[PDB]
Curated annotation (Swiss-Prot):
One of its GO terms (biological process) is D-glucose import. Changing W320R: Loss of kinase activity. Changing K48R: Loss of kinase activity. It catalyses: L-seryl-[protein] + ATP = O-phospho-L-seryl-[protein] + ADP + H(+); L-threonyl-[protein] + ATP = O-phospho-L-threonyl-[protein] + ADP + H(+). InterPro entries: Kinase-like_dom_sf, MAP_kinase, MAP_kinase_CS, MAPK14, MAPK_p38-like, Prot_kinase_dom, Protein_kinase_ATP_BS. Transmembrane segments: none annotated. ATP binds at V27, G28, S29, Y30, G31, S32, V33, K48. The modification Phosphotyrosine is found at Y306. This is Mitogen-activated protein kinase 14. It comes from Homo sapiens. Keywords: Acetylation, Apoptosis, ATP-binding, Cytoplasm, Kinase, Nucleotide-binding, Nucleus, Phosphoprotein, Serine/threonine-protein kinase, Stress response, Transcription, Transcription regulation, Transferase, Ubl conjugation. Component of a signaling complex containing at least AKAP13, PKN1, MAPK14, ZAK and MAP2K3. Within this complex, AKAP13 interacts directly with PKN1, which in turn recruits MAPK14, MAP2K3 and ZAK. Binds to a kinase interaction motif within the protein tyrosine phosphatase, PTPRR. This interaction retains MAPK14 in the cytoplasm and prevents nuclear accumulation. Interacts with SPAG9 and GADD45A. Interacts with CDC25B, CDC25C, DUSP1, DUSP10, DUSP16, NP60, SUPT20H and TAB1. Interacts with casein kinase II subunits CSNK2A1 and CSNK2B. Interacts with PPM1D. Brain, heart, placenta, pancreas and skeletal muscle. Expressed to a lesser extent in lung, liver and kidney.
């Protein structure tokens, strides 16, 4: 049987959650989230109410996607699903979805408010991001939106990558700025690079005002593409644009990041490569000397394969809705261990 629910109202939204969750308290409003106490395990949790999960085909599919992703993630440094529930008793009345996950202290701008964050602290936080990224990437998933607010950190400096929930453009790979279609997983590595840079210096590495400015600032540090990179660019206007602007040489990263651990500077050089074919991967970055104290090859697991064939399907709202319902139904709680 499904358990006992109770209703209430928080800000502008109704909330119908199991009695198992208590002391709901808004924390930030894709949907709004409450901190709650979970009576069954004794932990504080985050409960997200999806906003009109089935508003359109695009919403319906997004809802399905997020549920499928969150159900698959089982790794210390990736946000995972504690619970998913609807008040609804049947598919006919299935209208709301709530997701339950660990409540973590802050996110990375908040958890890194001490501008000059320690080098040992950056090691451990970046290590953990890369460990989560290895796992995510191994499933053929690209995050695409890595940024400080997508990194949840508790008081112990333990980090989890959040799927969803300071401009996005600031952490965005330049191939994406340029609207390249066939980017790879290393767009996330670029973002880690920008994050690490910001943690080591206290400043946003590339605070572009828009996509043009963003590129300009990026090229300023890493240099304008060489002939090797240019010859891989399939768009004429893109090729002509970057070939048109003033040719910057790559800066010396040791000079730009003065006094930072030389190993951190070296990793940054490997992450912030303009050409994504030459960018370091998550797995490679974890073996980098900079993570000497943390890197353990037998405890950096990969994910079970992840079936995202659904992404190429065009279905009706009710079909996505029902697939989502099946996913809510078949959810097996993570073990109390
Ligand atoms: N193998 C590759 C490697 C890198 C690439 C890149 N990135 C460079 C920062 C500009 N950009 C583009 C591209 C293609 C079409 C339109 C706009 C951009 N392609 C790339 C192909
Ligand atoms: O520290 C902010 C935060 C931590 C953990 C979860 C969170 O939002 C959620 C909550 C449930 C599912 C997906 C994301 C936000």
């Amino acid at each position: 049987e499904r358990p006992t629910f109770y209703r209430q109202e928080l800000n502008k939204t109704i909330w119908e959650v199991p009695e198992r969750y208590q002391n709901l308290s808004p924390v930030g409003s894709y949907g709004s989230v409450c901190a709650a106490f979970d009576t069954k395990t004794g932990l504080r949790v985050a409960v997200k109410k999806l906003s009109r999960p089935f508003q359109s085909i695009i919403h319906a599919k997004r809802t399905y996607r997020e549920l499928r992703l969150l159900k698959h993630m089982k790794h210390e440094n990736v946000i995972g699903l504690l619970d998913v529930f609807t008040p609804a008793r049947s598919l006919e009345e299935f209208n709301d979805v709530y997701l339950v996950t660990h409540l973590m202290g802050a996110d990375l701008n908040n958890i890194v408010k001490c501008q000059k964050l320690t080098d040992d602290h950056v090691q451990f936080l970046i290590y953990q991001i890369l460990r989560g990224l290895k796992y995510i990437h191994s499933a053929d998933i690209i995050h695409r939106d890595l940024k400080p607010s997508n990194l949840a950190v508790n008081e112990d400096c333990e980090l989890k990558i959040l799927d969803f929930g300071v401009a996005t453009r600031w952490y965005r790979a330049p191939e994406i700025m340029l609207n390249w279609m066939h980017y790879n997983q290393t767009v996330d590595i670029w973002s880690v690079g920008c994050i690490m840079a910001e943690l080591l210096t206290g400043r946003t590495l590339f605070p572009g005002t828009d996509h043009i400015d963003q590129l300009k600032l990026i090229l300023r540090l890493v240099g304008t593409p060489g002939a090797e990179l240019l010859k891989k660019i399939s768009s004429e206007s893109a090729r002509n644009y970057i070939q048109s602007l003033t040719q910057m040489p790559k800066m010396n990263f040791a000079n730009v990041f003065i006094g930072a651990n030389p190993l951190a500077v070296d990793l940054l050089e490997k992450m912030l490569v303009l050409d994504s074919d030459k960018r370091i991967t998550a797995a490679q970055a974890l073996a980098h000397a900079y993570f000497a104290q943390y890197h353990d090859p037998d405890d950096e697991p990969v994910a079970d394969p992840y079936d995202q064939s659904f992404e190429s399907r065009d279905l009706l709202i009710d079909e996505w809705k029902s697939l989502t319902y099946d996913e809510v139904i078949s959810f097996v709680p993570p073990p109390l261990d």
